[PDB]
Amino acid sequence: LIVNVINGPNLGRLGRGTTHDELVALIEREAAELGLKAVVRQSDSEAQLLDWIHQAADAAEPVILNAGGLTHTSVALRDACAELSAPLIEVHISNVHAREEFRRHSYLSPIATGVIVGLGIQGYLLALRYLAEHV
Amino acid sequence: LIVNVINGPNLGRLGRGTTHDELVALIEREAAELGLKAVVRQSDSEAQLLDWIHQAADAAEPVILNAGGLTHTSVALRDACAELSAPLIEVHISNVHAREEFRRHSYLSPIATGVIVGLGIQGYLLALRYLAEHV
Amino acid sequence: LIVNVINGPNLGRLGRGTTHDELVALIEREAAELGLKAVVRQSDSEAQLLDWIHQAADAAEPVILNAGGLTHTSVALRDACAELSAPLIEVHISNVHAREEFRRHSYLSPIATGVIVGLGIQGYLLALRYLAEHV
Amino acid sequence: LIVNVINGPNLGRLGRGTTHDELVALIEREAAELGLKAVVRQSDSEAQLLDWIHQAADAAEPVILNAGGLTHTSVALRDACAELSAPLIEVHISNVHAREEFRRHSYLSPIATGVIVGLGIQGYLLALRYLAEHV
Amino acid sequence: LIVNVINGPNLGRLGRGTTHDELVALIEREAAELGLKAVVRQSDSEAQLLDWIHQAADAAEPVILNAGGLTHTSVALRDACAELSAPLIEVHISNVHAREEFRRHSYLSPIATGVIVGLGIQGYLLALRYLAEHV
Amino acid sequence: LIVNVINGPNLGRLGRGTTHDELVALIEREAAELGLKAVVRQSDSEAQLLDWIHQAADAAEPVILNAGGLTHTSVALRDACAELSAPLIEVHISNVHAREEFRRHSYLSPIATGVIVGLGIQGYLLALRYLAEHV
Amino acid sequence: LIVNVINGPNLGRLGRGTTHDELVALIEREAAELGLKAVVRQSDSEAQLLDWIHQAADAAEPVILNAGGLTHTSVALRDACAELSAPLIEVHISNVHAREEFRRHSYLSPIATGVIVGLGIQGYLLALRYLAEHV
Amino acid sequence: LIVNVINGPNLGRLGRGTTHDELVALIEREAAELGLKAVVRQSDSEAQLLDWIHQAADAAEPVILNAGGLTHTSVALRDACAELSAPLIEVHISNVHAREEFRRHSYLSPIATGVIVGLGIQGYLLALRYLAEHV
Amino acid sequence: LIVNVINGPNLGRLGRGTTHDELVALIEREAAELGLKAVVRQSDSEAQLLDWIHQAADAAEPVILNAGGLTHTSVALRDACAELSAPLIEVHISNVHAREEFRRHSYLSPIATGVIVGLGIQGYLLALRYLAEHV
Amino acid sequence: LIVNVINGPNLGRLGRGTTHDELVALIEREAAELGLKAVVRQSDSEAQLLDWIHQAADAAEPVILNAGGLTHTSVALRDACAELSAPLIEVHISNVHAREEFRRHSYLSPIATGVIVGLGIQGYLLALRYLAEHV
Amino acid sequence: LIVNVINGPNLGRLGRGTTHDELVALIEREAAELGLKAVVRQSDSEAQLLDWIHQAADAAEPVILNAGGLTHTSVALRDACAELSAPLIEVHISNVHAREEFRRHSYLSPIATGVIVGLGIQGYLLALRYLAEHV
Amino acid sequence: LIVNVINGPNLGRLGRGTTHDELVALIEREAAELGLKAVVRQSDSEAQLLDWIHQAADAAEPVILNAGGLTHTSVALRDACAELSAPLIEVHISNVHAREEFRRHSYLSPIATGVIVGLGIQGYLLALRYLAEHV
């Protein structure tokens, strides 16, 4: 049943129109409809994100990860994610390919099962649906 | 109602386990469930793909495009796609970021609404669901 | 008398304000005024473009070529053009140097007699005038 | 017995001193001497080349491929060739390493069994002899 | 009526077969035929070229510029040219794309209306004709 | 009659299944069948390889060269080879294009008549056959 | 009145001759003389820096930021800073252009109002004076 | 007392809202308030700029330099500036890091004491204040 | 006597066969045998690592550092390490040169006394022995 | 018992304060203490180094290799080393990462078990201790 | 008899121990001893340097050129020098290869007969001696 | 009195019009005229070249070195040359800047006193004259 949705730096600033609280609500509802339980967490702290990924590795739970700016910069986060035995879906709200060049490289994409970008907050819900149809 | 799903070179070879015919069947069924009509087309010919994209531009219809190898190589296809006024969702079955470096660059991604990779054939169905919730 | 004007992919979409049909009309008129006969052809198919270039090589006729996106991508088209014994003038309607970086490289320019960009549809007429004053 | 020899764009222009027709004759004769049957095909159309490669994959037949300019540019052709279970020998008539830098990169060489360049039309005959001694 | 034609370093050396004096004569004649007045100036001094460009910016007059080697090297000249409100047409006599790699980059092309290269001295006359048909 | 076959560093380690001694035997036999005399030499010493190439230049004899790792690294060997007036055929047993990136560059290929890679030890025999049909 | 001065990693080590405490004293005094109130904060924690930047965005207050090593590495910090509606002045004590190449790139400079480097601790005081004369 | 403020090409065009004459006035006033004497000079001529820098080197006077486009292009200007024994402060009015990539490289910054960009004309006044507090 | 051994992100995950607790035990034992006292610390938090490095700089104690993914990414950690007056030995358990290209660059190696990679956990013990023989 | 220590070009010049003879003495003593027999060899000749590596491959003996300048340049040496079935430890006396950029790339490191740099001559002794604890 | 020695920007600053006046004296004396007449000129103005090179081209006289910083930056100077029919010897006083990377590229060296660097002022005298022995 | 002139690979092939023997004769004569004794040596063996450089380092004698292809490739030769306390003059007969790009980089030039290229065999004689006037 359990899927971890992990949001990295600055994702707490959503809607400052959907807020991060609203995003959690939307995800929890969709997960329930799909027969899943979503655990949604957000932090601006890389160490905190690492701890959540370590917990998902120890529990063999899937992860939907939007690492924010750390997507483009953190080898440490990639290394934690490499431990995951269940699926890892990378999600970005914006189309990172339509922006600055530095955003078009991800340390996570090569080790992710798959990647959804540019579909807004619905990307998280689509990632949930992938996991529901593959469990 | 209408969404065009356009598959480029080599996509006719799927399952030679899901075949291209089965993919069409799956897409048509999901579209029907979502209240859409999917028109699925495949060609190994760039000129044929261009014609289908031109038709979607003239009709102001959305496109889900898996251009195959042309993703990485064709400016002509990007230019045709730039004419689309409705959404363009790029889909790849494989995780192109986990493969050769040349596959990590797309001429289409910068002009697409969004991009789904690595989620298998379900990526097309998720793209349909995005379009259904945004119409 | 004879000059071949060859337009590549997407050039049939002009004005969808001058249409491709209007462009042909303008070119034919100017050619007539210059004492030339312009044969204007357009295709989205690389193979078709190659055939037209092969015919111009066999006839030792000049070519004004706007290869569209193939300018930036096709070695095959460059190789066909390398056979031309008469002048080859590359024309682009837009200023390809004021756009994306990938548009600033042409496989054709090194083998062309010369290149006109950014002067709109008048570029074709200026190319005709070059050929008229050099015949 | 059967070996497919596939020639890409511009190879029909040979000798416009050996013509493409003469090349076919030479190949068929050598194949016969080696106890093989050579099926020689040429097209300026990438889609046509893809279809021939798909047929060789379905038949588990070897391919001697001179893709012309598509060697340097086509991921789609590489992807079709990756399906071949029998040997793939890349042949170029000219020494592509003694020419422009862009000719020194091939999308096909990494997936080919081997590569012969610069030995003229005899390269095809040597490729046939490799296949005859390895069958 | 007025068009400024500005030639940069080494252009005074033309024909040392058309000389720079002959070029001025040819341009003035063509301008007269087109109903324009051409003011042709040449200098080996970047500061002098800048002053002429500043004058054209203050007068809102078009410029046909062949900056010679400064095309490839001068940000200062680009910055002066960015002030022009009327059209800027870059002209090179030689096909700069058929020469050394450093000649294939221009600081001016991205801010020019358009660019003519490789058409010899006729390039200036064609630039005049563009300006005459667009005034 | 005489063809020099020169093997560079590590080629003495073949089969430590064909050994270098067996390779010499195979080459000598094929040469005899073709009406040639093959002189096969191997050294791990660049200076020794240079001396053999100098001798072939002084005698105007062809060379089949597999320089081993020096292919990718030695300008001195390229310079010696540039003196050869008779054909130079570069041979590699492995497909150097299917390996590390550094193996895809050769200092020798631009000055070779042609290049055979990935066809195993038969590559040497095919090179002999090229030389026999071109003498 | 309020300006936030935010110092990143290692800036607490100043003078271990001006210490970080002395820097705060100097800044507070200058701000008072200029009719401003400076709030000076330092952390080695990226998450803490992000929180301070988020607070300045919510309050529409200017920021003088010396992000230390994060200048060169953190997309997350750039993204937080992109939310600021008031001016952002980047300050470095050392001349980062006179040091290692990696220090000559900043993720912050493109989104900053301006940048002062190499003027020592006086750079902060000059940034304050800019803000005082622009309020 | 004496500080040289040297402006390079195109800086005479300021306000064609602060004009170069107004800039001189503002600088002279601020210098007077700081107990300095500012000597402000502008030229579009690199040779003239070099002469002014040579004079400042011979007099051991500080320089505030805004070299305009020569910042990005002139080794000669860097070499003249390397002779200065007193401080060299590079100033740019615009934020050169928020513009084209070529503007993000300066030949002067590595040899300058420090660099101020993007603070408008106030940058010169802040540079003066640095020099006043360090004399 | 005192040596600080500092482990960065993900090193707490060792053996999830040697665990991080076992590593501490092994290091403490070897240090004791060498007449040293090892203080072993691990954190996933860059700020925490910085604090430990600052303490070692203030105490003039040597450091054996395995920064994990921060090796490849953190300028802040390099800057903290640059303050160390005693030796800094970089250790990696895996051979970072046999892995992805991004792992072959370290911000720490240029400022380290030396570097041990690929020798497993014994690398830490060898680093201790270096420090014991150099004290 | 047997470990081969192989030193490449210029290592005979050590101390011209530890000489190469002293290095051999130190290594032999440490090996004896560890229950190993060290065979230490040095040559300025790549061919000689290759022969020693071939002997170690045939004997399945470990190698501690300091290839000197050949580390950065020789594919032939890498290829010989790839044959080793026992461990290969690369040692450099100097910290090659603190020097010129060309020294930061090694053809050997990717195929080595591990690498020790910058620990002086003690690096060889530490490599011996690794081999003793892993036999 | 006549050789032109042309010095570019900043060369007038020599000895501010040999001065530029002393350099002229030394050159004139050596030229006289060699049976040549040296005409030595220096300017900080690119236009002036171009004029001197144009005069040498018109007179078919050799040139010894030390272009100072323009060596690395000026295509215009290269283009003027390309007109010279007599020898062009590039001289630099300093060893430009032992300095910043940007100094290791010269626009002039590819078109020069030869190049002398790092031999101090004697380089000019050696260039004279080359010209004397080749006239 | 003593100067070592060391020629690397392929230099024994000179005139196969001046031969290497003639070059030795010319050098010895010029050295005698200058009051020097030239010891001229040539080898195709890097190890032999290293030994000669080691001897010159031990004797504190100057070296004129034309390393042939090793100029562009050998770090080992650079490292031997770095030991020289007397001057090192690099000489190339050809203008290496007018040839292939790989020839425009030298491992030796940064550590040489100076470099002469493109002046033919006279370059060695000019190098001798530099050493004579600086002893």
Ligand SMILES: O=C1[C@@H](O)[C@H](O)C[C@](O)(C(=O)O)[C@H]1Cc1ccc2sccc2c1
């Ligand atoms: O941090 C990010 C950027 O650094 C990434 O390049 C893209 C990114 O992760 C994404 O689009 O999902 C984004 C999160 C992101 C996207 C939109 C908003 S609105 C307020 C915050 C916020 C954060």
Ligand SMILES: O=C1[C@@H](O)[C@H](O)C[C@](O)(C(=O)O)[C@H]1Cc1ccc2sccc2c1
């Ligand atoms: O052509 C492609 C590659 O050139 C792309 O890089 C990726 C790609 O478009 C995708 O994964 O969707 C793929 C289609 C693709 C993927 C799997 C199969 S199995 C038989 C055909 C086929 C085609």
Ligand SMILES: O=C1[C@@H](O)[C@H](O)C[C@](O)(C(=O)O)[C@H]1Cc1ccc2sccc2c1
């Ligand atoms: O295909 C192209 C682009 O791929 C090229 O980079 C530039 C190009 O060839 C040119 O500007 O002439 C252009 C044709 C081009 C330009 C404008 C229009 S409006 C409808 C079609 C169309 C096509």
Ligand SMILES: O=C1[C@@H](O)[C@H](O)C[C@](O)(C(=O)O)[C@H]1Cc1ccc2sccc2c1
């Ligand atoms: O198209 C090609 C070029 O684009 C490739 O770079 C090399 C190439 O495939 C090869 O040499 O075999 C060549 C075919 C080629 C070579 C010689 C001739 S003469 C008339 C046509 C033709 C085609």
Ligand SMILES: O=C1[C@@H](O)[C@H](O)C[C@](O)(C(=O)O)[C@H]1Cc1ccc2sccc2c1
């Ligand atoms: O200076 C130039 C070169 O630096 C540019 O790369 C190209 C260029 O501007 C052009 O071809 O118009 C050329 C002018 C150019 C072209 C031909 C001649 S013959 C005597 C002078 C001269 C100058």
Ligand SMILES: O=C1[C@@H](O)[C@H](O)C[C@](O)(C(=O)O)[C@H]1Cc1ccc2sccc2c1
């Ligand atoms: O040295 C080489 C490599 O350095 C080259 O990149 C490729 C190469 O020359 C080739 O494949 O012919 C190879 C010889 C080579 C190939 C196979 C074997 S098995 C024992 C030795 C050996 C040597």
Ligand SMILES: O=C1[C@@H](O)[C@H](O)C[C@](O)(C(=O)O)[C@H]1Cc1ccc2sccc2c1
């Ligand atoms: O961290 C930094 C470097 O990583 C940056 O490249 C430059 C930098 O931010 C700056 O010069 O302001 C510097 C702060 C910096 C500068 C000097 C000192 S002395 C003790 C600490 C410290 C920190």
Ligand SMILES: O=C1[C@@H](O)[C@H](O)C[C@](O)(C(=O)O)[C@H]1Cc1ccc2sccc2c1
């Ligand atoms: O020449 C320049 C550009 O080439 C530099 O990249 C930036 C630059 O020096 C700066 O911003 O100070 C600028 C001067 C500059 C800035 C604004 C204006 S408005 C009329 C002239 C002018 C000149």
Ligand SMILES: O=C1[C@@H](O)[C@H](O)C[C@](O)(C(=O)O)[C@H]1Cc1ccc2sccc2c1
């Ligand atoms: O984080 C790291 C990678 O990011 C580094 O590139 C290499 C690295 O520091 C090293 O090999 O020591 C590694 C620590 C590393 C190595 C093996 C394991 S098993 C569970 C954790 C873990 C951590």
Ligand SMILES: O=C1[C@@H](O)[C@H](O)C[C@](O)(C(=O)O)[C@H]1Cc1ccc2sccc2c1
């Ligand atoms: O040749 C080398 C350089 O080319 C390598 O880049 C580094 C290197 O192998 C190492 O430091 O071990 C060094 C050997 C080296 C190091 C120090 C000295 S003192 C006299 C000789 C010598 C040789």
Ligand SMILES: O=C1[C@@H](O)[C@H](O)C[C@](O)(C(=O)O)[C@H]1Cc1ccc2sccc2c1
């Ligand atoms: O301008 C130059 C630099 O820009 C070049 O990179 C090298 C250069 O041309 C050379 O060394 O000859 C030098 C002239 C040079 C060399 C030494 C001095 S001392 C006072 C002036 C001056 C000028």
Ligand SMILES: O=C1[C@@H](O)[C@H](O)C[C@](O)(C(=O)O)[C@H]1Cc1ccc2sccc2c1
């Ligand atoms: O080996 C070399 C090339 O590899 C270098 O790039 C340049 C080089 O050292 C030089 O020109 O002095 C040359 C020696 C060189 C130059 C001319 C001839 S004619 C017969 C041999 C030979 C060798």
